[PDB]
Design an enzyme around this catalytic site. Sequence first.
Site, PDB file in Angstrom:
ATOM      1  N   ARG A  74       0.827  -1.202   0.000  1.00  0.00           N
ATOM      2  CA  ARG A  74       0.000   0.000   0.000  1.00  0.00           C
ATOM      3  C   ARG A  74       0.864   1.256   0.000  1.00  0.00           C
ATOM      4  O   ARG A  74       0.558   2.230  -0.698  1.00  0.00           O
ATOM      5  CB  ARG A  74      -0.943  -0.011   1.205  1.00  0.00           C
TER       6      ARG A  74
ATOM      7  N   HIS B  89      -5.794  -6.065  -3.380  1.00  0.00           N
ATOM      8  CA  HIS B  89      -6.623  -6.115  -2.181  1.00  0.00           C
ATOM      9  C   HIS B  89      -6.843  -7.534  -1.681  1.00  0.00           C
ATOM     10  O   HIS B  89      -7.518  -7.718  -0.666  1.00  0.00           O
ATOM     11  CB  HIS B  89      -7.958  -5.406  -2.425  1.00  0.00           C
TER      12      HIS B  89
ATOM     13  N   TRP C 237     -10.493  -8.495   2.769  1.00  0.00           N
ATOM     14  CA  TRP C 237     -11.105  -8.882   1.508  1.00  0.00           C
ATOM     15  C   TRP C 237     -11.136 -10.395   1.321  1.00  0.00           C
ATOM     16  O   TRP C 237     -11.975 -10.895   0.561  1.00  0.00           O
ATOM     17  CB  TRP C 237     -10.359  -8.249   0.332  1.00  0.00           C
TER      18      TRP C 237
ATOM     19  N   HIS D  17       0.759   4.207  -2.642  1.00  0.00           N
ATOM     20  CA  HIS D  17       0.340   5.542  -2.224  1.00  0.00           C
ATOM     21  C   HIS D  17       1.383   6.603  -2.557  1.00  0.00           C
ATOM     22  O   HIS D  17       1.023   7.767  -2.764  1.00  0.00           O
ATOM     23  CB  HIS D  17       0.019   5.558  -0.731  1.00  0.00           C
TER      24      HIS D  17
HETATM   25  C1  HEM Z   1      -9.704   3.036  -6.368  1.00  0.00           C
HETATM   26  C2  HEM Z   1      -8.530   2.557  -5.943  1.00  0.00           C
HETATM   27  C3  HEM Z   1      -8.224   2.205  -4.462  1.00  0.00           C
HETATM   28  C4  HEM Z   1      -8.897   2.526  -3.340  1.00  0.00           C
HETATM   29  C5  HEM Z   1     -10.169   3.385  -3.172  1.00  0.00           C
HETATM   30  C6  HEM Z   1      -8.203   1.936  -2.215  1.00  0.00           C
HETATM   31  C7  HEM Z   1      -8.578   2.051  -0.895  1.00  0.00           C
HETATM   32  C8  HEM Z   1      -8.056   1.349   0.169  1.00  0.00           C
HETATM   33  C9  HEM Z   1      -8.517   1.428   1.539  1.00  0.00           C
HETATM   34  C10 HEM Z   1      -9.674   2.308   2.061  1.00  0.00           C
HETATM   35  C11 HEM Z   1      -7.766   0.608   2.275  1.00  0.00           C
HETATM   36  C12 HEM Z   1      -7.915   0.380   3.792  1.00  0.00           C
HETATM   37  C13 HEM Z   1      -6.723   0.962   4.543  1.00  0.00           C
HETATM   38  C14 HEM Z   1      -6.882   0.686   6.017  1.00  0.00           C
HETATM   39  O1  HEM Z   1      -8.024   0.800   6.539  1.00  0.00           O
HETATM   40  O2  HEM Z   1      -5.865   0.362   6.678  1.00  0.00           O
HETATM   41  C15 HEM Z   1      -6.801  -0.027   1.400  1.00  0.00           C
HETATM   42  C16 HEM Z   1      -5.846  -0.947   1.770  1.00  0.00           C
HETATM   43  C17 HEM Z   1      -4.895  -1.483   0.932  1.00  0.00           C
HETATM   44  N1  HEM Z   1      -4.665  -1.092  -0.371  1.00  0.00           N
HETATM   45 FE1  HEM Z   1      -6.087  -0.206  -1.640  1.00  0.00          FE
HETATM   46  N2  HEM Z   1      -7.116   1.243  -2.696  1.00  0.00           N
HETATM   47  C18 HEM Z   1      -7.094   1.382  -4.067  1.00  0.00           C
HETATM   48  C19 HEM Z   1      -6.151   0.830  -4.906  1.00  0.00           C
HETATM   49  C20 HEM Z   1      -5.066   0.077  -4.504  1.00  0.00           C
HETATM   50  C21 HEM Z   1      -3.960  -0.355  -5.338  1.00  0.00           C
HETATM   51  C22 HEM Z   1      -3.840  -0.005  -6.838  1.00  0.00           C
HETATM   52  C23 HEM Z   1      -3.113  -1.069  -4.564  1.00  0.00           C
HETATM   53  C24 HEM Z   1      -1.776  -1.767  -4.925  1.00  0.00           C
HETATM   54  C25 HEM Z   1      -1.287  -1.896  -6.164  1.00  0.00           C
HETATM   55  C26 HEM Z   1      -3.668  -1.113  -3.226  1.00  0.00           C
HETATM   56  C27 HEM Z   1      -3.108  -1.761  -2.141  1.00  0.00           C
HETATM   57  C28 HEM Z   1      -3.631  -1.859  -0.871  1.00  0.00           C
HETATM   58  C29 HEM Z   1      -3.208  -2.775   0.178  1.00  0.00           C
HETATM   59  C30 HEM Z   1      -2.078  -3.826   0.067  1.00  0.00           C
HETATM   60  C31 HEM Z   1      -3.966  -2.547   1.256  1.00  0.00           C
HETATM   61  C32 HEM Z   1      -3.872  -3.276   2.617  1.00  0.00           C
HETATM   62  C33 HEM Z   1      -3.120  -2.361   3.579  1.00  0.00           C
HETATM   63  C34 HEM Z   1      -2.945  -3.007   4.932  1.00  0.00           C
HETATM   64  O3  HEM Z   1      -3.496  -4.109   5.161  1.00  0.00           O
HETATM   65  O4  HEM Z   1      -2.244  -2.409   5.786  1.00  0.00           O
HETATM   66  N3  HEM Z   1      -4.854  -0.404  -3.227  1.00  0.00           N
HETATM   67  N4  HEM Z   1      -7.005   0.452   0.118  1.00  0.00           N
END
Ligand code: HEM
EC number: 1.11.1.5
Lengths: 294, 294, 108
Positions: A48, A175, A191, A52
């Site tokens: 993430r 995700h 997820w 980001h």
């Molecule tokens: C419309 C696009 C996206 C949205 C709205 C989005 C939104 C989010 C949100 C709300 C979380 C929860 C964070 C938390 O509560 O700790 C999350 C987690 C995460 N995102 Fe997405 N994301 C998007 C695209 C992506 C992309 C493109 C990647 C990687 C290539 C990604 C990788 C991750 C990962 C690995 C997590 C898990 C983080 C953790 O467990 O600490 N996301 N994302």
Amino acid sequence: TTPLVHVASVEKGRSYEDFQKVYNAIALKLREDDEYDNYIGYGPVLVRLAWHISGTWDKHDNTGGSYGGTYRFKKEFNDPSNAGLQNGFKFLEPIHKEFPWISSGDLFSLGGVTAVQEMQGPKIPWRCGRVDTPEDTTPDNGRLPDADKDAGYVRTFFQRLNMNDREVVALMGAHALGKTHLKNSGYEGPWGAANNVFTNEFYLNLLNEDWKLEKNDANNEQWDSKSGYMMLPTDYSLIQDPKYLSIVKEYANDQDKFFKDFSKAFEKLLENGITFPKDAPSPFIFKTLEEQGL
Amino acid sequence: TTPLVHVASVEKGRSYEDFQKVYNAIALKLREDDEYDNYIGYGPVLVRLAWHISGTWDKHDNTGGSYGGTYRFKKEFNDPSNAGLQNGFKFLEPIHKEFPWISSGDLFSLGGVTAVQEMQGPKIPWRCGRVDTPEDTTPDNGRLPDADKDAGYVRTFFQRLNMNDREVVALMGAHALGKTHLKNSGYEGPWGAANNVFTNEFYLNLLNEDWKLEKNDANNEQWDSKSGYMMLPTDYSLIQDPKYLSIVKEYANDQDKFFKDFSKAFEKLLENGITFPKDAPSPFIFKTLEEQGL
Amino acid sequence: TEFKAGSAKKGATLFKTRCLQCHTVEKGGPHKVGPNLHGIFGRHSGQAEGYSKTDANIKKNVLWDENNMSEYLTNPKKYIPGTKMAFGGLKKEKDRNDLITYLKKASE
Ligand code: HEM
Ligand code: HEM
Ligand code: HEM
């Protein structure tokens, strides 16, 4: 004229062997710090984090992206969209102390590549040469995508990152890793079940789980299944849109195709905004810890 | 087995006088249908129609172009890129009833020439002989250009239309006419103040307005001025590219040269793909309504 | 007075759609593409309270009345040679009486 160009510059006298050592440093710490977030580990947060710092790019004026490593500065570090990523920055801080020659953007992007590979994902080619830029280069808050949206928002957002439908659906398969944390984003739950192994479980759960719209304790609506999984509004939009849905079914059926497509889209994401000189070295493909007997 | 050649055939027993009447009919309706699009009129939409029927041409296999009048068929009429042009079709629809002998391609292209001239633009020589082709000759969607792109995309797209840098920058001056509509293209707002009079203000606004990259209500990014004008990303790329910028300054300083260059490029655009026989008439230059006493 | 008068309601509609891009009417209003039109029925056009006209405006010295203004709004690129006002012209006579009625009151 010439709008701002970010030319990659290899760290002085550094080569492939040096970055494999940094990969190894990160990859071993991922193995030893396996208690984080109820034994999920730091793998998902490093992915993430890399997304980001890259997702701030704006193709229209070439601002943002991973080149400048500006997440280290206060304005970006305290972005509401980056809540929780502080654990990834602190994970990489000692590694940066061990290898102070590597740039901030290189270490951040390398953290994501190491995490995907070490979670048994596909090999991700990685190019060095990002150069830390001044604090004024930090992009203002609000370039990262909001979860509370539909498919048209997702498609239009990722056009700003020069990503098409196939690249979007592929990048969204990350995700499969980690979970949402109510305190960070206003959403709660994983997820999938294998949220520290890189698989195509995201697309399988999208298509095979019965989803019901429900408010969480933060007063946000999210899609929940009886088995305890969740989907953000933007995730669930991937099956509401017909062109997205066809690609979700493709990756749900063929994990190897998803692996190939994610590797290209992820490397493209990590390199958006970077101009690589003509004599730049070919992308590095690092060996995993397992391929080194570790 | 055969080569792709579109041979122009003059409408049976029609000459300059016949086509001036059609010009006059189009031009009279432009004068009296003054309320359309908050008193902009049908001038700009007719110009965009003529460019969209011509802009589907591909020089590599000589498909597309204005010759066949294929915009009248379902596939081209429903191209997402042609959203809003149905108003131009409905405009010329009664004129075609008045002159059923003229081909669809001739009528669509003559409407663009009439609009330019009647909005006080340069005289544009026009050739007849486009022939309606069957429905199976309709080009697939996807041949018209996207607005969320940079100078390299603009340059390479118009190469497909056999247009060089001078013709590209001249043709783009037509954006002094009309406005973007959010419901049609995902972009909202005009390019300038005198949006139904043909001038070089597109280049003056590009150079003299204070532009800021901003979101619109459709989640798309565009450049906006404090004066309430906008520029598409493809428009703004003309001042991001140094070769384009040189031409933009030339046209901002000399409206006469811009009018001459636009007339050549626009006639070239409407004639791409058409092979005119050796017994073909010289191009017509039509009189405006003012020159005819109106 | 042979100039026909019209409704300022549609005159206000015409000014905001065909004039407001380049002109304001209010006292102290900023100049835009065109000069501020407060008190246009007081003296001649050009010079104004500031603004830089061309070489054709300031030299003609026409005190805007209610019909020569109506004449200028029909085909501006005719009454004076070298004006910067790029206007298609109000052709409909019912458009030209409503706007002047609205303009002779908004300009005081
Ligand atoms: C419309 C696009 C996206 C949205 C709205 C989005 C939104 C989010 C949100 C709300 C979380 C929860 C964070 C938390 O509560 O700790 C999350 C987690 C995460 N995102 Fe997405 N994301 C998007 C695209 C992506 C992309 C493109 C990647 C990687 C290539 C990604 C990788 C991750 C990962 C690995 C997590 C898990 C983080 C953790 O467990 O600490 N996301 N994302
Ligand atoms: C629309 C209905 C409209 C009106 C009415 C209007 C008025 C107007 C006047 C009375 C003048 C003369 C001012 C003077 O003598 O100082 C004038 C001149 C200019 N205009 Fe105008 N105008 C209308 C429309 C428009 C539009 C749509 C534009 C621009 C897109 C425009 C601009 C100008 C300019 C510039 C001038 C100055 C002329 C010069 O400097 O030679 N007007 N207008
Ligand atoms: C890279 C090239 C181009 C791009 C990306 C582009 C894109 C667009 C877009 C998005 C709109 C908005 C339509 C709407 O919302 O109603 C528009 C309108 C318009 N285009 Fe362009 N265009 C290009 C080239 C041209 C050319 C070559 C011409 C003519 C020679 C032209 C003439 C017009 C006109 C007159 C309008 C106004 C339409 C109206 O007001 O109804 N454009 N264009």
